[PDB]
């Protein structure tokens, strides 16, 4: 967890994670567990109902880096969603599902809840996000105390 190793870990393209996009939903707050717990269920349900029509979630791969969270389509590699760190307000895992998590994107009054179904556990992704957020906060304080101590 050395600031130096952690900075190397999120540098550039950062960490990659194979997953599927459950869905994107418009919410009202920038945070809250119940609110962000409910929205997950609403999205999984839309997905569940779609299975009857031979629907499938879009296979994607996502990156966690200083650019925030990016979602790339697995087939064409095209970047479909880029959510900068300062636009992300809340991270929340799914209690009844260890392979799914979500987060809220957007500026005040225009939030969105993104739901993801990871190939492996969602634990490592939540952890990386946590550390990346904390890191940036620290680097921002220190690199501010310095400029203001000029």
């Amino acid at each position: 967890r050395s600031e130096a190793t952690l900075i190397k870990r999120f540098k550039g393209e950062g960490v990659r994670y194979k997953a599927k996009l459950i869905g994107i939903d418009e919410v009202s707050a920038a945070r809250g567990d119940k609110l962000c717990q409910d929205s997950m269920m609403k999205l999984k349900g839309v997905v569940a109902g779609a299975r009857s029509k031979g629907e499938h979630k879009q296979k994607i791969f996502l990156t966690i880096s200083f650019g925030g969270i990016k979602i790339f389509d697995e087939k064409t590699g095209a970047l479909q969603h880029h959510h900068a760190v300062h636009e992300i307000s809340y991270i929340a895992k799914d209690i009844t599902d260890h392979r799914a998590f979500g987060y809220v994107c957007g500026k005040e009054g225009n939030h969105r809840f993104v739901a993801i179904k990871t190939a492996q556990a969602a634990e490592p992704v939540i952890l990386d996000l946590r550390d990346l957020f904390q890191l940036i906060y620290e680097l921002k304080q220190r690199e501010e105390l310095e400029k203001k101590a000029q």
């Binding site: 945070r31 567990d33 760190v85 992300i88 929340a92 895992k93 946590r130």
Partner: peptide
């Protein structure tokens, strides 16, 4: 539990 981003905004 969930985690809020300290640098949000």
């Amino acid at each position: 539990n969930g985690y809020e981003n300290p640098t949000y905004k």
